[model samples]
Target: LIFILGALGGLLYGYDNGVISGALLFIHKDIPLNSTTEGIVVSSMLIGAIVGAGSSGPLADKLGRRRLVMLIAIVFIIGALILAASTNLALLIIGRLIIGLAVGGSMSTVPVYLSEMAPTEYRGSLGSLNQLMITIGILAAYLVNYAFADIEGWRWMLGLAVVPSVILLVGIYFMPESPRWLLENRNEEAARQVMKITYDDSEIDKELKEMKEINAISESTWTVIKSPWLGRILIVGCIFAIFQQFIGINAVIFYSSSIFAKAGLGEAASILGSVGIGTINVLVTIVAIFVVDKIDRKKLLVGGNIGMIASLLIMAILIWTIGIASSAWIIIVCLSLFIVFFGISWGPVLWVMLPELFPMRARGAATGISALVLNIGTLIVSLFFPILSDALSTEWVFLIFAFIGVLAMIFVIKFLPETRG
Candidate 1:
C-alpha cells in the first residue's frame, strides 16, 4: 500500500519531467521561446525541485512526512491544472514551477516515507518501487505523446496527471502515520498501535525495542554529519545523486525529439521513436528492480556506466562515420540502446541505494542534499544541452556524454562501496 501511495508521487515527478519534452513542440509553435526561455521551460521544474528538496526536510520534520506528502499532492493538483489551462508562456512557466515544487518534495520525502515504513528485510525492494513507478510513468508519457502528436494534445498530456495526484491524496488519507515518526514525537502508545497494524503483532515488541535503540544512537542531522562514518556515507550519497544526473540521462530524455530530428527523422517519427526509448527505459528499470537485491549496487552502477559509455561511444562513431543524413534507423537503434543501458542500471539503483547508505536520523537531510545535487546536475544538463548540440554538433555532444560515463564508471569502481542483500 505504501509502495502504491509513493508511486503516485513518482508518477507526478515522471510526468512533470517527461511532459515538457513533448509539450515543447507545440509550445514552440505558440510562443517564441528563444534559447533562454527554452532553458527556463526545460529547467524550471528542476529549480522548483531544488527548492522543494531543500524545504522537505524542515517541512517533514516539523509537520511529519505523511502530511507533507499530502501537501505535495495538493500542490501537484494545482500545478497540473495550471499547466493544462495555461495559454500564455508566463502562465505555463509558473505552472511548471508549481509542479516542480511538488516533484522536488516528492523526490525528497517519498523515499524517507518508504524507508521508514518498510520492514528491514524488504526495505530496499519496497523503496525501489518508487523508481520503477517513475519509469512506468515516463513510459506512459511517451505513449501519450505518440498518441496525441497529430492533434497537438500537450494540454491533455499535462492535465492527465491530476488523476494520479487525486488518487494519491485520497489514498494517503486512510494510511497510517509512520511508526518511527510517532515514536520520535513521544507518542509511544500511538506508535505501538501503528506498529501493531503494520507488522505481525508478535513482532511488535521486538520492533519497539529496535526503534528505541535506533532512537538512542540516532543523532541530529548536524551531529550525523559531524560523525566520521556518517560523513563518509553523506559524501557517498551526494556523489551518487550528482553522478546519476551528470551522466546526462535527462539530456537524452528532454531533448530526444530534437536529437532525433537532427538525425534526419521527421517530427512524428521522432516522437514515436521517443516512445521506443521510454519503453526500453521502463523495461530495463523493471529488470533492475528484480536484480538489484540479488546483485550489489556498486556492481550495477559499474555495469550500467560501462553500457552507457559503450552506447554513447558507438553513437558518436555512428554519427561521425555515417553522418545524420545517412539513415534514420541508425540513430533510432543507437538511442534505444542508450536508454536500455541507462534503464537497467542508474535509473533505479541510485534511488534504492541512497537511503540505505544514510543513517536514519540523517535520512531526510542527507536525501535532501543528494536531491539538491541531482537537480543541480539536471539544471546544468538542461541549460547546456541545446547550446552543446548547436555548437558541437550531435556527434560531439554524444561523445561528451560518453566521456562523462567513463569517468562515472571509474568513480563508482574506486569510491563507491557495494550495498546488497
Candidate 2:
C-alpha cells in the first residue's frame, strides 16, 4: 500500500515530462516559437528541476518524506494548470519550469522513501517500483498524446497532468512516513510503530536494533558524505547519475517524435512511434523489477551498455550510409532495443542503488545531490541535443552517444560495487 502510494509521484513525474514531447509537436503552431524559443521552452524545465533536486534533500530532511511529496503534488497541480491556461510563450515556459520542480523533487524524494520502507532482501525490486511507475507515467503520456493529436490539443495533454497530481495528493495521506526518517529525527517509538506495520512482527525488533546501531555511528549527513570513504560512494553515485543521461536516453525521449519524423514518418506515425518507445520502456522495466533482486547490478549495467552501444552504432551506421528516409524501420528497431536495454538497467538500477549506497543520515541529502548532478547532466544534454544534432546531424549525434556508452560501461566495471545484498 505504501509503495504504490509513494510511487504515484513517479507517475506524475513521467507524465509531465513525456507529455511535452507530443505537445511540442503542435505548441509552436499556435505560439510564435522559432528554433531558439522552442529549445528554450523545452529546456527551461531543467532549470527549475536543478533547483528542485538540489533543494529537496534538505526539504525532505526537515519536513519528512511524506509531507514533501504532498508539497510536490501541489506544485504539480499549479504547474499543470498554469501550463494549460497559458496564452503566451513566457507563461508556458514558466509553467514548464514549475512542473519541473515537482518532477525533480519527486525524483529525489520518492526513491529514498521507498528504499527506506522496503525490507532488505526485496529492496531492489521494490525500489525498482519507482522507476516502473515512471515508465507507466510515460506510457500514459504517449497514449494521451495520440488521443489529442488529430485536433492538436496540446493544451489538453498538458492540462491532464492535474488529474494524477490530485490522486497523489489525496492518496499520500494514508501512507506512513519513512520509518528510518522517524528513527533519525523524530520519536524512536514512532519509528518502531511504522516498522511494526511495514515489517514482519518477528523482524521488527531486530531491524530497529540494527537501525539504532547504524545511526549511532553516523556523523552529520554533510560531514559523513565529505569523509573520504563515504565520499567515494557519493562520487560513484554522482557519476552513475551523469552517465545515465550522457547515453542519450532523454535526447531520444524528449525528441522521439522529431527523431521519427526525421527518420521518415509523418506527424501521426511519429507520435505513434513515440508511444512505442514509451511502451517498450514500461514493459522492460517490469521485467527489470522481477530480475533486479536476482541479478548483480554491475552485471546488469555492463550488459545493458553493450546492447545500447550496439543499437546506437547500428542505427547511426544505417542512417549515415543508407539515409534516414530508407532506414526508418531499422531506426525504429534499433531505438526499441535501446529502450529495452536502458529500461532494464540504468533506468531502474540507479534509483534503487543510490539510496542503498548512502548511509542512513545522508540518504536524503546524498541522493538529492546525486539527483542534482543528474539534472545538471540532463540540462546539458537537453540544451545541447538540438544544437548538436543540428550542427552535426542525427547520425553523428548518435555516434557521440555510442562512444559515451563505452565510457559508462568502463566506469561501471572499474568503479561501482555490487549492492545487491
Candidate 3:
C-alpha cells in the first residue's frame, strides 16, 4: 500500500511531465507564448525540484519520512490548483515550481521509505519498483495529453492531478513512519514495533542494526565529501546523475509533441505521437525491470549509451539532410529506438548504480547531491532546449546531446566499476 502511495508521488511527477509535452503545444498557441516564455512554463518545476531534492535528506531526517510525504502531498494540491487556474505564464510557472518541489523531495524519499519498510533481500527489488512507477506516470500523462488536446485541455490535464494527490495526501496518515527513521529519532520501542510489522522476527535485529549504523554516518553532506573514498563515488554519482539527463530522454519527453509538430507532423499527429513514445517508454521499461539485475550494470550503461549516440546522431542527420517533413516517419523510428535503448539502459541503470557507488554512511548525503545534479541537468536541458533550438536549430540540439552520449559511454567504460566489487 505504501508502495502505491509513494508511487502516487511518482505518478504525479510523470503525469506532470508527460502532460507538459502536449500542454506546451496548446499553451504556446493559447497564450501566444514565445520560445523563452514557453521554456519557463515547462521547466519551472525543475528549479524547485533542485531545491527539493537537495533538501530531502535533512528534511526527511527532521520530519520523519511519513510526515515529509504528507507535507509534499499538500504542496502538490496547491501546485495543481495554481496550474489549473492560471491565466498567465507567471502563474503557471509558479505552480510548476511548487509541484517540482514536491516531486523532487518525493523522488528522494519514496525508495528510502520502501527500503526501510521491507525485508533485506527485497531492498533492491523494491527500489526497482520506484522507476517502474515513474514510467507508468509518464504514460498516464501522454494519454491525458492525447485525450485533451484542445485549448482548455491543458487545464484539465493539470487539474486531474488533484485526484491522486488527494488520495496520497490522505493515505499517508494511515501508514506508519519508517522504522529506521523512528530508530534515528530515539523511539526504540516504536521502531521495534514497525520493524516487527515490516519484517519477520529474525529480520528485526538486522534491520535495526543497519539503520543505526547509517544514522551514525549521518552528518552534513560536505562532511561526507571530505573522505577520499566517499568523494570518488560522489564524482561517479554526479556523473551518472548528469548523464541520465544529458542522454536526451527529456528532450523526447518534455518536448515530444512540439518536436513532432515542428517536423511537419501537425498538432493532432504530434500529440498522438507523444502517446506512442509514452507507450514504448513504459513497455520497454517493463523489459528493463526483468533484465537489469540479471545483467552487468556497467555493460548495460555503456551499451545503452552506444544506442543513444547512434540513434540521436541518426535523428539529427536525418532532419538536417532529408528535412523534417520528408523524413518524419524515419525520424519517428529513430526516436522510438532511442526511447527503447534509454528505457533499457541509462534509464534504469542510473538509479541502480547510484546506491552501489556509496558506502552506507555517505549514501544518503551523497545521493542528495546526486539528485541535485540530476535536477540541475534537467533544468538546463528543459529550459534551454527551446532557446538552443531557436539559436542553433533543432537538428543541432540533438547533435549536441549525441556528443554527450559519446562522452557518457566513454566515462562508464573507463571509470564505472562493476557492481560485484
lDDT per model vs. reference: 0.69, 0.71, 0.72
Candidate 1 lDDT at 353 equals 71
By summed lDDT, the worst window of 10 consecutive residues in model 3 runs over: 217-226
Better of 1 and 2 by lDDT: 2
Mind giving the per-residue lDDT tens digits that candidate 3 earns over 1-421?
Answer: 7667667667776777776777655645666347677676667878777777777777777667777877878778877766776566777677778877877867766666666666555647665676678777878776676677475665775677777777778667677666666676776677777777765678667667766755665643446364687677677677778888887577677566676665536766565567776788888888886886677778877778788888888888897785766666776677787888787787777776776666645666677777778777777788877656556555676677788888888888788779865
- The residue ranges of model 3 lying beyond 4 angstroms of the native Cα positions read 119-123, 176-178, 217-224, 227-229
Which of candidates 1 and 2 reaches a greater TM-score? 1
Q: Judging by lDDT, tell me the better candidate of 2 and 3.
A: 3
TM-score of each: 0.88, 0.86, 0.91
4-42 per-residue lDDT for model 2 (tens digits): 755677778877667766664454466644545656766
Off by over 4 Å in 2: 63-66, 113-124, 150-152, 174-183, 186-202, 219-224, 227-233, 293-296, 353-364, 390-392, 414-421
Which of 1 and 3 is the better model by TM-score?
3
